[PDB]
Structure 1
Amino acid sequence: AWPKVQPEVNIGVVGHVDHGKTTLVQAITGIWTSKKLGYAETNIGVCESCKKPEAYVTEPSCKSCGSDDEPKFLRRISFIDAPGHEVLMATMLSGAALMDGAILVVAANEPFPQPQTREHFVALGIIGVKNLIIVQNKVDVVSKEEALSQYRQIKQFTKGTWAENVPIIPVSALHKINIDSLIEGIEEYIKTPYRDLSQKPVMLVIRSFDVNKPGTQFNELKGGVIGGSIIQGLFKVDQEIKVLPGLRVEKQGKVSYEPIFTKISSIRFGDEEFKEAKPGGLVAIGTYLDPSLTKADNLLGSIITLADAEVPVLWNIRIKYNLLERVVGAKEMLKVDPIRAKETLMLSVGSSTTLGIVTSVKKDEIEVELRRPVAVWSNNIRTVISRQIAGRWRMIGWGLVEI
């Protein structure tokens, strides 16, 4: 049979709203994710007797190509499908911190390139998720020649760009057409990255919940669960951990943050239990925390490390920054203005997003006073910078958080 193992790689699914991201994930995994960020897993195998791409399978069966032989197991993979709506760009940025590679979904029956087609694309480039496949979705609704016409636009768009040789794979997610070619492309272009498991364990938090059913007996109350993805190193059951920045405290008009210390009581990927958690997949860390602390994604944006790790938790940061020429996600083309002092910016760092006031601007560096602190677990940490333009937070640049 096939091993029951954790997913070993995270594939983002991004692109403009309604282009078919969620349907594409369902086409691949059989799972419909109504949750955003959405999440789903599948095993991937190959029938070694049969010809490709239909040799690739997402279940342990080669019936569809003749064999009663079991297909060779290749790996378990995970999809993170980001929301496409322009107002949800911050959520796309959080999710991108979790991605090892991405699929950019482009609807074949809409004029390319749409605003979030562009914004998601450049966001991926900035944060370095460059193992990209471009998927031309909804080909079922246009003629071959119309699809090809857009194909050459996509090629024109990526030319002269880091994505110049990114593959473009046409499919119908809704009617499940040419999905085998996408799976073959996933194996070819989105390899599982090398993981240095000696690095200090860091997990980025995107969810937290109280898993207790209603009216549950108080002696019966399970501890809080925290969901996210392990970004480096690995965690084990019964490891002493902390959540950073942690818990916000009133005290009584002056707000501060206190690290939350706890212990890993259980580890879970999907519905399977494990003893360890490594990079790849969305992990649910069980803890001894009061469920009231982890209710309703309360800890989104936090990180988790071992209890004794040294981690700066900063209310002021220095960023070595670069601005985009123009505001890519806007409908109307707009040039980005230089950072000005005393202007509030939105910073995405890991899975967190937080507002700050610019206290210093230089050609290559800004300093900002944060409304809430961020945990900075490493020296070269990419941040994405957004400005409120048009009543809406728009990506305008990026930087390195300098410590």
Structure 2
Amino acid sequence: AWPKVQPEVNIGVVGHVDHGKTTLVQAITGIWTSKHSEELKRGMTIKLGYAETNIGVCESCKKPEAYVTEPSCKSCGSDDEPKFLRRISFIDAPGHEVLMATMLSGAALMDGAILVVAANEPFPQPQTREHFVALGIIGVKNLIIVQNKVDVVSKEEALSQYRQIKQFTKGTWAENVPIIPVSALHKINIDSLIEGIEEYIKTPYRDLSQKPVMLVIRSFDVNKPGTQFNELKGGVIGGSIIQGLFKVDQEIKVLPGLRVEKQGKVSYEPIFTKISSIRFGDEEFKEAKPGGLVAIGTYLDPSLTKADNLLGSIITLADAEVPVLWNIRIKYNLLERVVGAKEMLKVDPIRAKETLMLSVGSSTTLGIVTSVKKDEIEVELRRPVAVWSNNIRTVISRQIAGRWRMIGWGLVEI
């Protein structure tokens, strides 16, 4: 007997156009976004790739083949049941991680990361090296480099890459980074991969009783044409619990909440409505919590949720220490080189009265720095961020040419 629990952790998977994308998660999980997702999504447009999978490790068997994903501990000559472990969730970027459409949404979700790089591809790959950059900028705790396409080339050439990876990871934040040989469209050493996922990207440490905070990443009016008024419920909220515990029947609010349309000015009056329900993937749960992705039932006017309206917001408890600021101050230390198309450019330090792009967890606001110092500056954002911890991390971007590109990171000071 294996218990049905909500995901408990969250791992993102990125890399160049190097294969397999969704295929690797699929090689670990099953059916999900973004073409179907059942029984979850009844249609959609673009967005990210989400899939959670059970993970159990079999005691009777031998490492690493002892690692399983379902209760069928067959391939070890024993009828014994595994020891139920974790409920890992996987999220990936179908083409929005970096360089295009920066939201940081899923980026704040990373309890770890998998940098996949095809072995048939010369390392380091252009786009992949900038992927490794964001992993240090957004500071994803615990990552692993998975050599894909290992089946394409000899182990010996599979080591010509190993060199280059170790060579690329000389004196960086990741020296003990794992490099896992794995196969794409085929299932080779995937279980060993699991092992590492169970060692390097370990089950996180959290505090059961802290400030419940969820981060709206999408919202939609679930009622489709033909739902009669007598029978319908307020649109749900996407997002993910980052701290604390949420329950049904529990009163919460979203910040900054609803914008105010009056006079010649504009503000934001936070929206107060309760949690109708919880539901992780297929099943409908009872007490939302960190790890994995969730969707919350509500009493809002669906007009408010429809079309990912609230996304980039933040769900917090009915009443709490929830500073919403039209001006922020962040310590920092930016980079010196910006990579991308063609070759890396020379990026100057933050300029005064300049408009930068600030991504705070689930949000991405453009603000103007109203005073610069060495380790710190103040930014006049156009949309009120909803700070909550002196430790929160913001990603700064500057529009060099057409759009914005990551240039540094810093903590919000309050």
Could you tell me the TM-score, scaled by structure 1's length? 0.95
Deviation at 1:231, TM superposition (A): 0.7
The answer for unaligned runs of 5 or more in structure 1 is: none
Change (3 A) 1:87 1:279: closer
Which residue pairs with 1:165 in the alignment? Answer: 176
Change (3 A) 1:72 1:130: same
Helix, strand or coil for the counterpart of 2:300? coil
Deviation at 1:181, TM superposition (A): 1.1
Is residue 90–residue 353 contact of structure 1 (8 Å, CA) maintained in 2?
A: no
Deviation at 1:351, TM superposition (A): 0.8
Change (3 A) 1:327 1:255: same
Deviation at 1:275, TM superposition (A): 1.5
Is residue 329–residue 413 contact of structure 2 (8 Å, CA) maintained in 1?
A: yes
Deviation at 1:88, TM superposition (A): 5.4
Helix, strand or coil for the counterpart of 1:119? helix
The answer for unaligned runs of 5 or more in structure 2 is: 36-46
State the distance in 1 between where 2:196 and 2:28 align: 13
Helix, strand or coil for the counterpart of 1:144? coil
Change (3 A) 1:92 1:354: closer
Which deviates further from its counterpart, 211-220 or 230-239? 211-220
Deviation at 1:90, TM superposition (A): 5.1
Deviation at 1:345, TM superposition (A): 0.8
Helix, strand or coil for the counterpart of 1:330? coil
Which deviates further from its counterpart, 277-286 or 11-20? 11-20
Change (3 A) 1:89 1:379: farther
Could you tell me the TM-score, scaled by structure 2's length? 0.93
Q: State the Cα deviation string for residues 80-119 of structure 1 (Å, max 9, x = none).
A: 2134457655546321211111111112222322343233
Change (3 A) 1:199 1:364: same
Is residue 257–residue 269 contact of structure 2 (8 Å, CA) maintained in 1?
A: yes
Is residue 47–residue 71 contact of structure 1 (8 Å, CA) maintained in 2?
A: yes
Q: How many pairs align?
A: 403
Helix, strand or coil for the counterpart of 2:257? strand
Helix, strand or coil for the counterpart of 1:124? helix
Change (3 A) 1:100 1:157: same
Helix, strand or coil for the counterpart of 2:24? helix
Helix, strand or coil for the counterpart of 1:247? strand
Deviation at 1:126, TM superposition (A): 2.9
Which deviates further from its counterpart, 79-88 or 392-401? 79-88
Deviation at 1:328, TM superposition (A): 3.5
Matches within 5 A, 1:280-319: 280-319=291-330
Change (3 A) 1:378 1:85: closer
Q: State the Cα deviation string for residues 7-64 of structure 1 (Å, max 9, x = none).
A: 1100111222344231111111113432832211111012222222121111110122
Is residue 15–residue 117 contact of structure 1 (8 Å, CA) maintained in 2?
A: yes
State the distance in 1 between where 2:182 and 2:372 align: 47
Is residue 218–residue 308 contact of structure 2 (8 Å, CA) maintained in 1?
A: yes
Is residue 85–residue 116 contact of structure 1 (8 Å, CA) maintained in 2?
A: no
Change (3 A) 1:9 1:349: same
Which deviates further from its counterpart, 142-151 or 30-39? 30-39
State the distance in 2 between where 1:394 and 1:356 align: 15
Q: State the Cα deviation string for residues 189-236 of structure 1 (Å, max 9, x = none).
A: 111111111211111111112222321111111211001111111111
Deviation at 1:291, TM superposition (A): 1.4
Is residue 84–residue 92 contact of structure 1 (8 Å, CA) maintained in 2?
A: no
Is residue 18–residue 116 contact of structure 2 (8 Å, CA) maintained in 1?
A: no
**Which structure has the highest helix share of the two?**
1
* Residue 224, structure 1, aligned to residue 259, structure 2: no
RMSD: 1.8
State the distance in 2 between where 1:24 and 1:32 align: 13
Q: State the Cα deviation string for residues 228-254 of structure 1 (Å, max 9, x = none).
A: 111111111111100011122221442
Change (3 A) 1:136 1:390: farther
Which residue pairs with 1:22 in the alignment? Answer: 22
Is residue 96–residue 124 contact of structure 1 (8 Å, CA) maintained in 2?
A: no
Change (3 A) 1:291 1:391: same
Is residue 83–residue 91 contact of structure 1 (8 Å, CA) maintained in 2?
A: no
Helix, strand or coil for the counterpart of 1:218? coil
Is residue 8–residue 75 contact of structure 1 (8 Å, CA) maintained in 2?
A: yes
Deviation at 1:276, TM superposition (A): 0.6
Which deviates further from its counterpart, 62-71 or 379-388? 62-71
Change (3 A) 1:298 1:17: farther
Helix, strand or coil for the counterpart of 1:347? strand
**Which structure has the highest strand share of the two?**
1
